[PDB]
């Protein structure tokens, strides 16, 4: 078992929160790439890609906030 | 059960809202393709196709608005 | 019961508005086809066919206007 | 009493501005659907439908302008 | 097997919908060209040519609508 | 009773300020999803969605300003 | 009193402009229908019907022009 | 007399600068709402609404600049 | 004296530029409505209506350009 | 009467300097929370909130400077 | 002096171009109406009426062309 | 083997997704250029060109979204 | 010498390109207005007017393209 | 002589660069307002207005760039 | 004569350096507030406001540097 | 030498194509007018007049086609 | 060798696709201009002119599509 | 030899990439200005102008991207 | 062998990580500069340039983080 | 010879590094100010201004870094 700190556990709450969003984006892109003119495949990929943008931005700002909460405690040791 | 977030649920309100509009367009196109000169088949396909344009544009703008409401909250975490 | 949106309901106001105009055209054509020289059958078919031209053009422009009223609202979501 | 904000009140100035334009369109369409060949019913429906296009486009652009006036104030809080 | 996307499949529903309309126009034109004064050959070619006008215009507008449904989804990715 | 600080109370002034805007958006979307072609349902949903964008952006910037007013006082303790 | 907008008032300038042209056409048709061989009744009905064609075409183009003048102002709000 | 600081006085230079622009927009909207098809009422409301967009954006950027001039002086006290 | 900004003054250059074009259209329509078959009244109304279309479109685009010149200056304050 | 030292008196010069700025922010937020789409309520709240940011930052830096002037005198007793 | 724009001046080049063609048609019709069997009065009225058809059609197409030249410049302001 | 990152692999999913769409456009253009009047060659080229527009726009927006997902992570390193 | 920028110089390439097309249209209209029934004067005016439509549309689109080339450079300064 | 800094001198290079473009726009608008149907006055005003859009946008972006070059030097004093 | 130390003299080099920049901002704001849509008044106020931002930031950083040069000499007395 | 564009050169191919058809019609009409009963003068004038009808209709349709070929290129600049 | 980009090469596929269609139109017009009454010269020129209309419209729309495919890639660089 | 940095060298790759596109646009405009009705001169100028739009937009976005790559390195010096 | 510290080795992990991305950008720009209208050359350059933006921003933030990790250790020596 | 320390010599490496970039910006602005609509003058000024932004920001950060390297040595004398 590799080491995983608190910022890893915050990042793994988002990773285990979504079930297979990293898989559903890649599958719906590969279904879209075979036929990039189907409205049932473009509107399904729009919902996957727009969630994957919002999943990944919220996951990359929650880590940055907890990095800044810790950087004002560690700076107050000395 | 695959994962479905909030933008999927907004997209699935439109998908479960219409009963079989993705089926009625394909059926009325296949009825039209056998005889593309019947006014009862052209005027019926006009109503299906024009709804399928308005169904899909409203479904692809409501996702884009909720993607922009979330992108101004996630940007205000830090 | 199949799904029928608003453009279907506008199209079905014209379809249920006329009682059997899709039937009276086909019957008066089949009466005309047996004897295409009777003035009582040509002048009766002229009134059916000219109404069926005006019925179907008004039914295919009212759908196109309501498709354009909706396409300026849906475009103003974002 | 349900909640109605400022964009609802701008939209309700148009809705209470016209008296029964949502009713006069539906009535003049149902009078037209029984007899879609009367020039007194086609020219009366043309005036109702063309106003209902201009009523609804001006009502759907005034909301979009006030949404853009507010989105440049709210963006200037921070 | 060559690649065929969704707009090709919509275009091939019209092409496989009619059986040999691209052949019946060319055959009835070549029968007409040998004797361009037969009313049984002019009235048969009128029905083929007028269907081939309506077949090809409906096939070239259904592609253009589905190109415009997709161009409002693809524009809403970003 | 759960704990609610000052930023929660600023966020709950917006939440208790609107009566049922989180409900009126979901209801007017579910009314729109059954028939996404009615201009009385698209223009009503435009006013709800555009208010819900302006409600939520002003609620997510007022919290961020009060977080920045406090972060310049807390930084001036030491 | 029912609501009447500007396109109704343009249409009612033509309707109140002619006194009883909608009545004189119907009366001169009912006088013609009893005896459709009188030159004093055919030449009088020709003048009524040809005016009623020019009355109704000018009334249905002046509305369409004012609908297009307004549709280039309303489109320039946003 | 309530308190009004410098950013209020900059905001009140715009408010007392225009005489009754907050009134002329509401009056020209209520005149437009009774008859949303008059070109003399649409082109007059276009000039009021487009000024009210430019009035309010310049008033909401001049406050934000003076908030940023002060935030670089106050930050240079310590 | 009511307030009139720069976009009002651009709109009032067109309004004071034409002397009584808003009056000459209404007078030539009321002269046309009494007798909608005179070629001296149809060709005179064609010249008034076609100028009133070009007057009002140029007046509603010059305001929109000056609204866009100002919206790129006001956006460059901050 | 509770005790109030010099840093309290510097803080109370800002508190008694503004009359009711702690009240005008809370009132203009509660007026904004009932209708968060009015430009007269967003631009008025922007001026209150931006002053309340500059009031409170200048009040929390003037105390910190006088704490540092005193901490270099008290350190020079011994 | 009433206002006369460019389309009026194009229309007045035709009106001042012919000297009294609007008078010569009415005079030669009133001379014809007293005796509608004279070949010197029918052949003179044929030349007046056929010129008045060609005068008025060229005058009503030159205005429509200059309305379309201007409508492609005014549309290219924005 | 040249280097290909993740945005290249997203771009190569579209390139390897379509089999020879870059070839079928060039071949159907060169077949069209020899005889630009065949409806079987214009309607076949319409389906290739409209897919090649939708293929290339979706391929040039999916790269731009993944460039923006990465630019909000890389910006949150520091 | 008045100032003339680059869009003036593009517009003056068309103005100095044609020698006296603004004069030949006005002269051939004034020759046509004296006798609007000569086929040598109608067919000569058709060639002048149709060139003056194509001269002025190409001159009003080349300015609009160069305005759009510059508006994507000026927008890329900041 | 009033004070004029460097951003004024950059703004006065554009103001003294064009000779009387602020005058030529107002003169060509006042010539257009007297007769808004002349193609020689619409195409001349299009070239003035499109230059005045490009003059003013380049003048309002060059100031904003030099404001940002200075704001990264002044921020690097301390 | 009131007392003015060295940091006052550095601050008064900026105050006497600009002639009436504190007056030209207030005058160009009061000219802008009467008509907040003139491009000659918005682009003139942009140059005044952007200089007044750069004047005041450089004046509030030069004082802070000389306060830090002195605070490392005074700290080196003891 | 006056200016002559491409539509003039197409019109001058017809004018220089026929040698003196504008002269032979006028001469054969003046020979016919002295004696309008000679079969050698009526049958010669029939051949001149019927050619002058076909000359002038083909000359006035070839200009209109080339005006429409150019109007679909000029419209595709922007 | 002059420079020729991709839109030139698309335009030169049409130019080198037809062998001498720009020559066959000019030759068949000059053969028609000498004798504009031959049915073997009118029906041959109809086939050349109608192909030259379809050649040039397809050549001027394929360039405009590839200009729009590129304008959505170049816009997605930044 | 004048100085040319890296953004000049990126801009000079586009300038030396095209051979004489700045010359071919000006030559094909001056050939078009002498005769703005030739389809061989309009379709040749369309290909030059549409390339010159795509040349200049790609040249003005590649500079802006490399300005933004450098502005995130220079900002990371301190 | 020149000296290369730890921040050089972190920078050389990115430089040796990509194989020839500094070469593939320059080659795909020089292929694009010869023909800046090919969609196969614009979409290939978009993927190279967008990776080169993300390569260089991640390489210029990882150095800045390791410079800040070291600057909090070196500051804790004394 | 005036005195120039090490930070002057670092600043003079940038000043003598570029040959006449302070001159080429002022010359290309004065060439742009005479004609602010030439794409060859806007795209040339974009490359000068964007380099002058990157020249001056790198010159104003390299001085600030060397000021901070020295301020941690001078602080370690005592």
Author numbering:
A (entry chain P), B (entry chain J), C (entry chain D), D (entry chain I), E (entry chain A), F (entry chain O), ...: 3 to 80
Paper quotes:
Salmonella enterica serovar Typhimurium (S. Typhimurium), a gram-negative bacterium responsible for innumerable cases of acute gastroenteritis worldwide, utilizes two T3SSs, encoded within its pathogenicity islands 1 (SPI-1) and 2 (SPI-2), to invade cells and establish an intracellular replicative niche. The core component of this machine is the envelope-associated needle complex, which consists of a multiring base, an inner rod, and a needle filament extension that protrudes several nanometers from the bacterial surface. The entire structure is traversed by an approximately 2-nm channel that serves as a conduit for the T3SS protein substrates as they pass through the bacterial envelope. Furthermore, four residues at the end of the C-terminal α-helix, three charged (K66, D70, and R80) and one polar uncharged (Q77), form the lumen of the channel and create an electrostatic surface potential of alternating charges, which spiral upwardly about the needle, a feature that has been proposed to be important for substrate translocation.
